């Protein structure tokens, strides 16, 4: 238990009073003098991995680069590493990370007008309002997790085609499945009106 161990916890290095237990959901920086070990838990998140690596470079730089940095994968520790501690122990401890899923309030949804009349074609942001829904065009409501494509009763087949393709590309650029709901002018479900 001779090396100094820092437990990464919610964006900070916390020096462990009594090191030796390592949780599979977390990361640890182990300062063993001429050697600095990154201990990367197999269930840890990117924010924890990042702080460990960045902190190891800082500590090495503080000692003018004179330490060797080794990366340890949690659960596959070499014999060299386990023997540094009185009682090395692998646990299921997982401190929650600092990153949060993207969330939009309703005042943050965006509304897009889709127009296509011959070679007169464009997309264009418009104000988020029921007033903007024209019955001769197509409109996209972006709520982040759900994309509604509202097709006016008088919109062209080309505008409906374009609106769905644009919605597909929004879903493609956002990790995780975003639901695309095709909505018809005059039969809007309650879920759609709530976005206004």
């Amino acid at each position: 238990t001779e090396p100094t161990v820092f437990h990464i916890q919610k964006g900070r290095l916390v020096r462990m009073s009594d090191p030796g237990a390592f949780g599979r959901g977390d990361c640890y920086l182990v300062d063993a003098g001429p050697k600095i070990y990154l201990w990367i838990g197999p269930k840890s998140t990117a924010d924890e991995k990042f702080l460990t690596a960045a902190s190891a470079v800082f500590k090495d730089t503080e000692r003018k680069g004179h330490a060797d940095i080794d990366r340890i994968e949690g659960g596959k520790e070499p014999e060299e590493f386990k023997v540094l501690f009185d009682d090395f122990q692998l646990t299921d401890e997982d401190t929650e990370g600092i990153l949060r899923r993207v969330q939009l309030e309703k005042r943050e949804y965006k509304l897009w007008r889709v127009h296509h009349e011959g070679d007169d074609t464009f997309f264009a942001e418009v104000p988020l309002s029921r007033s903007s829904l024209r019955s001769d065009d197509v409109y996209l409501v972006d709520t982040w997790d759900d994309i509604f494509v509202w097709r006016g009763k008088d919109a062209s087949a080309r505008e409906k085609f374009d609106g769905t393709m644009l919605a597909r590309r929004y879903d493609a650029e956002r990790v995780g499945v975003q639901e695309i709901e095709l909505i018809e002018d005059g039969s809007e479900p309650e879920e759609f009106w709530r976005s206004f």
Partner: protein
């Protein structure tokens, strides 16, 4: 107050708020101006949709900001239209390509402080952000985006510039090649929605073959490799060997007439330019990042190609984090959230005292 993170790419801007786990704004890095017949410029999806009346330009070429007037429009759009924030209220983290010239980083800093009046800023190297987000200080990053592919060896936190390789082939070339080979099947892709179809097919149906010649033989002898894409109107496009011919271009640039080594050989060449004492660490830590590394099969193919080239007793490992499409941005989101990094941000008062060169110190 909360930091902003902007990862400006050749093809896509990725922007959002530090602490988010994904960029909330992702839009094309394109500026359109209605030249020669009062809003005088359009950005992003609106601009690309109006190509018929706008002159479109990409301000970032092969990862390097080249057109500063249009880049200012991109940043203005990012702050005010996409994120809807006041830049003078938010420290802003920007990213930069490998081998970005000093004068370029200084101009980025000048614009952020003098045009947008940010209270603080930082400029991070894209490849280092991706490597740290994987929990590594040492490794070789393969960053393949929309306009450029780099191999960036990094040793204990610092990129090794003499061994960085650049290949001017990435996602936009693959889109264009898929469009070419699908047009040879008799399709036409001219409208904005048609070009989006090609992009969607590339990202949903394509893959890297483990052995290209064997896969071509399979595709010739059966229809087991065909897969279909349904258009919004119910039409179906079916492709077979186009699925893997398209990204094969990364390994065989001659498919698009480029006389260059493929990405497996540039990786090997980059490792060989490093001191023999660190090559073992690079072989075991090939980290992929960027949208063009998302093809199913690419890690397994790289593992096979590098293993064929590498010396005896080396361990070859390709790391493809599931979040690698946006690993640069996510790395920046973490960085801009971390307490211990606050001392390394440039403040407006320091800029006022020292000028743009403070971004190096």
């Amino acid at each position: 107050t909360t930091a902003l993170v902007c990862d400006n790419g050749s093809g896509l801007v990725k922007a959002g708020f530090a602490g988010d786990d994904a960029p909330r704004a992702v839009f094309p890095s394109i500026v359109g101006r209605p030249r020669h017949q009062q809003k005088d410029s359009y950005v992003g999806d609106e601009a690309q949709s109006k190509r018929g009346i706008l002159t479109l330009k990409y301000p970032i070429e092969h990862g390097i900001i080249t057109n500063w007037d249009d880049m200012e429009k991109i940043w203005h759009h990012t702050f005010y239209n996409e994120l809807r924030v006041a830049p003078e209220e938010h420290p802003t983290l920007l990213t930069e390509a490998p081998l970005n010239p000093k004068a370029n980083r200084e101009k980025m800093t000048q614009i952020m402080f003098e045009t947008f009046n940010v209270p603080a800023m930082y400029v991070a190297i894209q490849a280092v952000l991706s490597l740290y987000a994987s929990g590594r200080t040492t490794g070789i990053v393969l960053d393949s985006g929309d306009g450029v592919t780099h191999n960036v060896p990094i040793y204990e936190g610092y990129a090794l510039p003499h061994a960085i390789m650049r290949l001017d082939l990435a996602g936009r070339d693959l889109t264009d090649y898929l469009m070419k080979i699908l047009t040879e099947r008799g399709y036409s892709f001219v409208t904005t929605a048609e070009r989006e179809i090609v992009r969607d097919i590339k990202e949903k149906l394509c893959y890297v073959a483990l052995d290209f010649e064997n896969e071509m033989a399979t595709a010739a002898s059966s229809s087991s490799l065909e897969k279909s894409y349904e258009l919004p109107d119910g039409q179906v496009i079916t492709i077979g060997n186009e699925r893997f011919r398209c990204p094969e271009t990364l390994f065989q640039p001659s498919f698009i007439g480029m006389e260059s080594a493929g990405i497996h050989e540039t990786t090997y060449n980059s490792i060989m330019k490093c001191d023999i004492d660190i090559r073992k660490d690079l072989y075991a830590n090939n980290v992929m990042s960027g949208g063009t590394t998302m093809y199913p099969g690419i890690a397994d193919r790289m593992q096979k190609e590098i293993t064929a080239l590498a010396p005896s007793t080396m361990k070859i490992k390709i790391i493809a984090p599931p979040e690698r499409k946006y690993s640069v941005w996510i790395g920046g989101s973490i960085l801009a959230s971390l307490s211990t990094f606050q001392q390394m941000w440039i403040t407006k008062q320091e800029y006022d005292e020292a000028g743009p060169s403070i971004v190096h110190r």
